[PDB]
């Protein structure tokens, strides 16, 4: 039992950490609960939360040196700079006191690491610096880690239209699925060749990428099921968000108890509160809903004054801010400037062509600190209060599923939603006033559902705006995720008239790939005719065909056909289809293109290429995939299974700049894993070596109303301290598709407690 002084804490508080590393906080005041959460989040994740803050405020170079200056400048270009009075009120009514209590608890732990250097996280010693003190405003001013779009897609679409000319619409059709499948129209007044992709992406990456430590510088699914369809008779609510994997993990599980507060679940460890989980009356989980929140604005600048741009027939001056960037090893801070138009920060300027480009990012406006709208539903007790809280949900765009212990279930999407009167938001626009956001939509303009006749709701990042609903015409967004996971889960959930918690856990682990099944179906139609017939004479081609013939499209870790297919579908087939459908230079820009759109061509190639050419492309690329699989196997006769290639290594940010012995302790190797980006058990990978990069780390399946029966997992662990056994103890549970209890009642928490922490006001 540890006992710590707690300056700023109002009343004594206790923390019971259970055997799986989940902290259970018991405070005597509402706001004391958030003090303890900040203290406990620092205890487990101080380096991580300090790193997020350092990156967000543009303070990296202060300790990491001159290579980080450009990233610090761009980070400050995308901090919230609006009115703070409005900002605090955007999230609910007491967000400022919550944030103030939280950072006081963080700062208490920081002070403790100065008093007791054995408590300082290893990474600080590894890099030669110390944790910083926090201010409440830091919590809401940092924005750039929020999931968002579509600045990058606008640049890519414009670049393709500039390069592909008359083939642009066909090439863009293969590059990116739109839903609904509208025809993009170049905005009047846009020259798509006046969009320098490399410079813009570089500036955008410097402004938004997570903290990175390169060698050079150092040399989702959710668903809710009504009780009439569950084995318990109570609702079941499940959620597994799909995000970057790493050690430590993106999210952290915790439990807050105080007078007026009883919430348990997950969130990013630097944010106060809980955004996925339940409060003993309602439960909630989320998946991305893609309202378009970024537009690239293109300006003409005055030749006599490059800091002025044309706006409504007048030269309008940019606002220029000066920032001081402290650099390790330099006595004076660097003085840098950042220019802003009336629409946002200038990412790039070209005085040769008298042009500038600014990011018009809705996430720089009030209320867009990611997930912090949960302030207003952590204490909601019914649907009216949950729907009300979602009225002010800012970022990221999300589908919320809802259930309560009275048996109700529901769905409401939310997020700051831009009105574009005269463009679709799919291309950059002239910034001279012809294209202006008309305001934001009220959330009651979006569809929603409450106790639907079906008795179940599934969302999985697909466009779920009903085509006959008025919102289908409002330009909410046209760029959604591949819909395979949604279709697969919708099939499974509708096909089970009675299902249990065990069944929902299994669905989160489902590895059937609808792209695989559809590709297999196309293969059965390949004609033994034209050049394809000769290719079927290749022993290597016939070897691959044999593997696929006896496969059901289940992307299992122990499956050799699955390995062949994932190699083929990611690195061979689609690039070959695109190259056979487009001129060479548009094909190079499109690459593997959009899986859904390429699948459509494979199934109906008529207007793209002769069916015989389709067949030839499939078998030629399949041969190359088989060659690669053999190349990657122990021998060409003992072939690698998918799991042999698809390694689940949770990588630490410093892995590439430390030695082998140190890397082995920072990284967490969980072995081989099944699945792909397109299976409900999402295990997206990088194409170089098929290693895991993204998917569900935190997973949750709740018995809504019998709370102690809830199940969760996280990975690789609850602790961010490599010397703590909770750093890596959850990864095997996750690797087996298993869970541990989400204990909630006082008796269950006591039964599960392994350590007690006592905080005393001082």
Report whether 598 contacts 522 (CB < 8 A). no
Distance in angstroms (rounded) separating the CA atoms of residues 673 and 692: 8
Q: Using DSSP, state whether 667 is helix, strand or coil.
A: coil
Write down the catalytic residue from 14, 93, 132, 220: 220
On whether 240 is known to bind a ligand per the annotation, the reply is no
Which of the stretches 397-405, 417-425, 491-499, 710-718 binds Ca ion when contact is defined by CB under 5 A?
Answer: 417-425
On whether 615 is known to bind a ligand per the annotation, the reply is no
Q: In what order do the strands lie in the sheet with 252-258?
A: 2-6, 753-761, 13-18, 23-27, 252-258, 261-267, 276-278, 282-288, 398-404, 409-414, 449-450
- From the list Ca ion, Cl ion, none, pick the one residue 295 interacts with, judged by a Cβ distance below 5 to 8 Å according to partner type: Ca ion
The neighbouring-strand residues paired with 291 are none
In the 8-state DSSP scheme, what is residue 131? Answer: P
Report whether 749 contacts 743 (CB < 8 A). yes
Give the CA angle between residues 310, 315, 320 to the nearest 5°: 95
Distance in angstroms (rounded) separating the CA atoms of residues 49 and 505: 30
On whether 10 is known to bind a ligand per the annotation, the reply is no
Kindly state the smallest distance separating residue 155's Cβ from Cl ion, in Å: 13
Considering the complex, state which of residue 480 and residue 685 has its C-beta at the smaller distance from Ca ion. Answer: 480
How many residues of this chain bind Ca ion (CB under 5 A)?
A: 4
Q: Which of 302, 334, 296 is nearest to 318 (CA)?
A: 302
Report whether 243 contacts 684 (CB < 8 A). no
Site string for Ca ion, 424-443 (x = CB under 5 A): -x------------------
Angstrom distances, CA of residue 338 to CA of 96, 200, 334, 561 = 28, 15, 13, 53
Considering the complex, state which of residue 294 and residue 721 has its C-beta at the smaller distance from Ca ion. Answer: 294
Kindly state the smallest distance separating residue 163's Cβ from Ca ion, in Å: 20
On whether 461 is known to bind a ligand per the annotation, the reply is yes
- From the list Cl ion, Ca ion, none, pick the one residue 292 interacts with, judged by a Cβ distance below 5 to 8 Å according to partner type: Ca ion
- From the list Cl ion, Ca ion, none, pick the one residue 39 interacts with, judged by a Cβ distance below 5 to 8 Å according to partner type: none
Q: Using DSSP, state whether 255 is helix, strand or coil.
A: strand
Single residue of 52, 88, 290, 423 touching Cl ion by CB under 5 A: 423
Told to check if 427 binds Cl ion by CB under 5 A, we report yes
The neighbouring-strand residues paired with 223 are 238, 458
Which of the stretches 148-156, 513-521, 638-646, 711-719 binds Ca ion when contact is defined by CB under 5 A?
Answer: 148-156
Which of the stretches 234-242, 346-354, 426-434, 640-648 binds Cl ion when contact is defined by CB under 5 A?
Answer: 426-434
In a 10 Å sphere around its CB, with 0-12 CB exposed, 13-18 middle and 19+ buried, how is residue 414 labelled? buried
On whether 26 is known to bind a ligand per the annotation, the reply is no
Q: Binders of Ca ion among 281-300, rule CB under 5 A?
A: 292, 295
Reply yes or no: is the peptide bond before residue 530 cis, omega within 30 of 0.
no
668-672 and 683-685 as β-strands: parallel, antiparallel, unpaired?
A: unpaired
Which of the stretches 39-47, 290-298, 415-423, 627-635 binds Cl ion when contact is defined by CB under 5 A?
Answer: 415-423
Q: Using DSSP, state whether 208 is helix, strand or coil.
A: helix
Considering the complex, state which of residue 427 and residue 740 has its C-beta at the smaller distance from Cl ion. Answer: 427
On whether 3 is known to bind a ligand per the annotation, the reply is no
Q: Which of 403, 434, 436, 437 is nearest to 417 (CA)?
A: 437
**In the bound complex, which residue of the shown chain has the CB atom lying closest to Ca ion?**
425
On whether 294 is known to bind a ligand per the annotation, the reply is yes
14 included as an active-site residue: no
Kindly state the smallest distance separating residue 176's Cβ from Cl ion, in Å: 13
On whether 391 is known to bind a ligand per the annotation, the reply is no
Distance in angstroms (rounded) separating the CA atoms of residues 167 and 169: 6
Considering the complex, state which of residue 418 and residue 457 has its C-beta at the smaller distance from Cl ion. Answer: 418
Annotated binding site: 150, 154, 242-243, 251, 288, 292, 294-295, 371, 425, 461
Give the residues lining the site for Cl ion (CB under 5 A): 423-424, 426-427
Could you tell me which residues are annotated as the binding site for Ca(2+)?
150, 154, 292, 294-295, 425
So which residues are the catalytic ones?
Answer: 220
Summarize the annotated binding site for succinate as residue ranges: 242-243, 251, 288, 371, 461
- Residues in touch with Ca ion (CB under 5 A): 150, 292, 295, 425
């Amino acid at each position: 039992t540890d006992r710590y002084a707690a300056p700023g804490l109002e009343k004594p508080a206790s923390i019971l950490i259970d055997r799986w590393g989940v902290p259970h906080i018991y405070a005597g005041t509402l706001y004391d609960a958030f003090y303890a959460q900040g203290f406990i989040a620092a205890r487990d994740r101080l380096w991580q939360i300090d790193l997020w803050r350092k990156r967000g405020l543009g303070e990296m170079a202060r300790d990491f040196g001159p290579a980080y200056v450009d990233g610090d400048r761009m980070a400050r270009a995308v901090l919230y700079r609006g009115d703070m009075y409005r900002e605090w009120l955007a999230y609910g009514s007491d967000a400022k006191r919550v944030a103030e209590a939280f950072v006081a608890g963080v700062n208490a732990y920081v002070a403790l690491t100065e008093a007791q250097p054995e408590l300082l996280p290893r990474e600080f010693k590894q890099l030669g610096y110390k944790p910083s003190r926090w201010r409440a405003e830091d919590i809401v001013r940092i924005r750039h880690h929020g999931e968002t779009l579509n600045f990058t897609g606008e640049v890519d679409r414009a670049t393709l239209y500039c390069q592909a000319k008359e083939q642009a619409a066909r090439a863009d059709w293969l590059r990116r699925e739109l839903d609904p499948p509208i025809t993009p129209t170049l905005p009047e007044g846009l020259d798509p060749c006046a969009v320098p992709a490399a410079a813009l992406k570089k500036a955008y990456t410097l402004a938004t990428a997570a903290a990175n430590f390169p060698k050079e510088a150092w040399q989702s699914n959710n668903w809710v099921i009504a009780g009439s369809r569950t084995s318990t008779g109570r609702p079941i609510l499940a959620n597994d968000p799909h995000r970057a994997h790493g050690a430590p993990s993106l999210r952290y599980v915790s439990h807050l108890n105080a007078p007026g507060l009883s919430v348990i679940g997950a969130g990013e460890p630097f944010l106060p509160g809980i955004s996925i989980g339940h409060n003993g009356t309602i439960a909630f989980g989320l998946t991305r809903f893609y309202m378009d929140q970024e537009d690239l604005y293109v300006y003409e600048t005055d030749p006599a004054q490059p800091k002025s741009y044309r706006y409504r027939g007048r030269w309008e001056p940019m606002e220029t801010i000066t920032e001081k960037i402290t650099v390790r090893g330099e006595a004076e801070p660097r003085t840098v400037t950042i220019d802003f138009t009336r629409h946002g920060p200038v990412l790039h300027a070209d005085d040769a062509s008298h042009r500038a480009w600014a990011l018009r990012a809705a996430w720089l406006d009030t209320g867009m600190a990611p997930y912090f709208g949960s302030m207003d539903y952590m204490r909601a007790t019914n649907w009216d209060q949950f729907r009300a809280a979602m009225n002010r949900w800012g970022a990221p765009g999300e589908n919320q599923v809802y259930a309560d212990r009275n048996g109700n279930i529901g769905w409401i999407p939310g997020g700051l939603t831009v009105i574009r009167p005269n463009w679709d938001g799919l291309f950059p626009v002239p910034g001279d006033g012809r294209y202006e956001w008309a305001g934001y939509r009220n959330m009651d303009e979006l569809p929603w559902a409450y106790n639907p006749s079906t008795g179940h709701i599934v969302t999985a990042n697909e466009n779920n705006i009903p085509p006959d609903h008025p919102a289908a015409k409002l330009g909410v967004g046209y760029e959604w995720s591949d819909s395979s996971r949604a279709r697969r889960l919708k099939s499974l959930v509708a096909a089970a008239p009675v299902s249990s918690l065990r069944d929902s856990i299994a669905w989160q682990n489902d590895t059937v790939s609808l792209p695989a099944q559809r590709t297999l179906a196309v293969m059965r139609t390949v004609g033994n005719a034209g050049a394809a017939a000769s290719l079927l004479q290749d022993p290597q081609v016939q070897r691959a065909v044999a593997l696929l013939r006896g496969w059901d499209g289940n992307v299992r870790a122990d499956s050799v056909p699955a390995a062949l297919f994932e190699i083929w579908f990611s690195n061979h087939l689609r690039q070959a289809v695109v190259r056979a459908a487009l001129p060479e230079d548009a094909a190079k820009l499109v690459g593997a293109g959009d899986a859904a759109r390429v699948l459509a061509v494979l199934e109906q190639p008529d207007t793209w290429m002769p069916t015989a050419r389709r067949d030839e492309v499939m078998l030629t690329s399949l041969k190359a995939a088989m060659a690669e699989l053999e190349r990657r196997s122990p021998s060409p006769e003992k072939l690698a299974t998918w799991g042999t290639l698809h390694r689940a290594i949770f990588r630490h940010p410093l892995a590439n700049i430390v030695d082998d012995a140190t890397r082995a302790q920072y990284n967490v190797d969980a072995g081989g894993i099944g699945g792909s980006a397109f299976t409900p058990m999402n295990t997206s990978y990088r194409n170089s070596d098929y290693h895991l990069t993204a998917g569900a780390s935190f997973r949750m399946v709740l018995d809504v109303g019998n709370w102690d029966q809830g199940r969760v997992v996280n990975t690789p662990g609850q602790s961010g301290d490599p010397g703590n056994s909770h750093y890596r103890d959850l990864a095997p549970i996750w690797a087996k598709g298993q869970t541990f209890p989400l204990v909630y009642s006082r008796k269950a928490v006591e039964r599960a407690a392994e350590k007690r922490i006592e905080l005393t006001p001082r």
